[PDB]
Design a protein around this ligand. Structure first.
Ligand code: ZN
Ligand code: ZN
Length: 204
């Protein structure tokens, strides 16, 4: 992995001890192309971009679960034939990308070979599963964007497209210049740590 344990440690000094480097390395096999496509520069830019986004969404990995508990019953899409079997309020944000919604627990679980729809707490109770859901989103989902974050970094669309795809709908397009700048600054710090250039098109 192009991020060493010592680098990961420096990246997230306030982290909840739930989030382990070993859990992350265990997760990598689910997406062997992740941080392993293109030049070593691109590999490191991708790793830094993933981890910067993760830092933003979880408060430097301090948090495992979504903190606004009032929102919990919100993530049940009752139109799904498979419904919300764990409970209407059990599909709240968990793990490095704050995986949310019954339909995303379903899709992620199907892709990973884990029954996350019927066991969503696995994402808050197991480090490897948590990291695997982050890599599932990064490598397969466009979110509110037009490309996967993996594609943005490997094909050179730039870091800004990853902001758009990872909970950036209220921040991009001039929505929240402060949050966009904060996200860019974190990515620049992580690329600096890894000893690579950040590349272009940093903003959205
Ligand atoms: Zn737009
Ligand atoms: Zn944000």
């Amino acid at each position: 992995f192009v991020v060493s344990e010592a680098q990961f440690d420096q990246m997230f000094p306030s982290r909840n001890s739930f989030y382990t480097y070993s859990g992350l390395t265990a997760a990598l096999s689910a997406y062997p192309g992740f941080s392993n496509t293109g030049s070593d520069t691109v590999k490191k830019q991708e790793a830094a971009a993933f981890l910067a986004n993760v830092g933003h969404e979880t408060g430097g990995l301090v948090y495992v679960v979504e903190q606004n508990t009032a929102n919990y019953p919100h993530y049940c899409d009752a139109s799904q034939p498979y419904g919300c079997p764990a409970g209407n309020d059990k599909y709240y944000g968990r793990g490095p990308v704050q995986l949310s919604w019954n339909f995303n627990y379903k899709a992620a679980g199907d892709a990973l070979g884990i029954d996350l729809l019927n066991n969503p707490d696995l994402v808050q109770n197991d480090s490897a599963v948590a990291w695997k859901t982050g890599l599932w989103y990064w490598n397969t989902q466009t979110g509110p964007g037009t490309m996967t974050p993996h594609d943005a970094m490997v094909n050179g669309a730039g870091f800004g497209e990853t902001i758009r795809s990872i909970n950036g709908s209220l921040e991009c397009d001039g929505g929240n210049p402060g949050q966009v700048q904060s996200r860019i600054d974190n990515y620049e710090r992580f690329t600096q740590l890894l000893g690579v250039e950040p590349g272009g098109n940093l903003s959205c």
